[PDB]
Ligand binder design. Structure first.
Ligand SMILES: CC(C)=CCC/C(C)=C/CC/C(C)=C/CSP(=O)(O)OP(=O)(O)O
Ligand SMILES: CC(C)=CCC/C(C)=C/CC/C(C)=C/CSP(=O)(O)OP(=O)(O)O
Ligand SMILES: [Cl-]
Ligand SMILES: [Cl-]
Ligand SMILES: [Cl-]
Ligand SMILES: [Mg+2]
Ligand SMILES: [Mg+2]
Ligand SMILES: [Mg+2]
Lengths: 253, 254
């Protein structure tokens, strides 16, 4: 019986693994051959997982089933999907993925993105994927920082205000009381402030995983976030160029 | 596709119907023949729905499928089920019920009762019930007031603090942001304070339904709660006795 929304192997690994950077591969932009090359290096660096994520997607199932299979044949790290949900479908899913990160956008003015996407997703389970083969679900509070009209237009999010800690303190009460597995602090166009990362680490339970991403391009940035309490520092764009091997070594340093 | 968690016919009915009392029949204590007699009177009184609810239950599907059918044969009012969920199963459900009230116990120290029961329930859908025939789900923020070790032991709830509005204001933000359909204020052993009812009415969206229940035994109490903002005032125990007709008449404000 699939753990589904209950803690399983992937969450256990994220809870126990040494904190560090995590490369995020956008499967709708990165050719699969390049993802496979990258996955082999991520393995050598001992990263906790390979995340495949993108704001945009189409023909999810026919594209992702073989992409996930190719990445999984290239690394023993778990492959975790992270994409926004769509009303009428819920979150996208394909067989073979180890886990799907389910973001509850608590800062959204649209209740579907705050959490009803989770009900639609679970109602649709198991669909065309054998139950035994379904991915695990990582229940995550997802928060956005800085001006970001793209996520705002698409998902209804409003940038979190840190002029006081009232707004984030409410999200931390939800994260704790609702037993979320992870919190994901994201900034599409700016940087999540290290002080907000510290505030979250201090307010979360010891087993709640803290992920931060957005415009991380240097090892100094990774270090600052980990020093602030992030368990994982995600980065995508820094490697979306020909000289990615150099960029990866500087970020993983 | 059944509406399921999306608004449907029952929530529309509750939103549009005028505020008033609602009798709650405990089907694991009330014989079905008495429930059927009761259901016929509730209809004449103009109540908005008939709730079948209980903290305790056993052999739910064999007892409730026919119990629901018997009640529905006696009244055209929607029949709504309200029972706590159980790990491994989620909320109990039978074919024929018009809706299930799904309580998210925000005051519980156990995340399963705060909301993961909702995930287990939806993962299990549709189970043995034809999909087209599933009840609608009324997403509800459920809060408890006063000392109540029974619900505390069973569901992990802690009485809501009414010393200030700090705790209830966080629940109101959740009720609004999460788009809950209803809020249910309950007191097993005391009375929900009318001022808390007012505070919720004022902070909720116009389409969010406010239910209050617990030890309501007089028409005066129903009036006070409606005057404070409740959409529906529930009552069960007052009618679990032989002279229930007279009690019902008094509570309905006859
Ligand atoms: C808003 C949110 C957290 C969750 C909702 C669901 C969405 C939009 C998922 C897409 C996955 C993400 C956040 C990809 C951007 S990697 P990055 O932008 O951090 O990469 P970068 O290193 O800046 O290129
Ligand atoms: C705690 C909560 C709201 C939801 C969690 C799920 C539970 C325990 C559902 C049982 C349904 C209830 C609250 C029945 C009591 S009617 P009453 O006790 O109000 O009737 P009374 O008129 O006092 O007899
Ligand atoms: Cl794993
Ligand atoms: Cl802060
Ligand atoms: Cl909130
Ligand atoms: Mg993309
Ligand atoms: Mg399902
Ligand atoms: Mg009972």
């Amino acid at each position: 019986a699939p753990p589904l929304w209950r803690p399983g192997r992937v969450l256990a690994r994220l809870r126990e693994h040494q904190p560090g950077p995590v490369h995020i591969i956008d499967p709708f932009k990165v050719p699969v051959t390049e993802a496979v090359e990258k996955a082999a290096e991520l393995t050598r660096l001992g990263f906790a997982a390979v995340l495949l994520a993108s704001t945009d997607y189409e023909s999810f199932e026919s594209h992702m089933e073989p992409y996930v299979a190719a990445v999984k044949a290239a690394t023993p790290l778990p492959v975790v999907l992270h994409f926004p949900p769509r009303p009428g479908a819920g979150f996208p899913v394909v067989r073979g993925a180890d886990a799907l990160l389910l973001p509850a956008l608590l800062g959204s003015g649209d209740d579907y993105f705050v959490w009803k996407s989770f009900l639609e997703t679970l109602a649709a389970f198991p669909g065309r994927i054998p139950r035994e083969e379904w991915p695990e679900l990582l229940l995550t509070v997802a928060l956005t920082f800085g001006e970001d009209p793209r996520t705002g237009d698409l998902l209804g999010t409003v940038p979190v205000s840190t002029a006081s800690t009232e707004e984030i303190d409410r999200y931390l009460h939800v994260a704790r009381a609702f037993g979320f597995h992870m919190v994901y602090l994201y900034s599409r166009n700016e940087h999540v402030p290290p002080e907000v990362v510290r505030h979250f680490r201090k307010g979360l339970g010891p087993d709640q995983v803290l992920f931060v991403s957005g415009n991380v391009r240097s090892g100094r940035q990774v270090t600052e976030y980990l020093d602030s309490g992030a368990d994982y520092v995600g980065f995508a764009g820094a490697l979306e160029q020909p000289d990615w091997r150099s960029a990866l070594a500087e970020i993983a340093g």
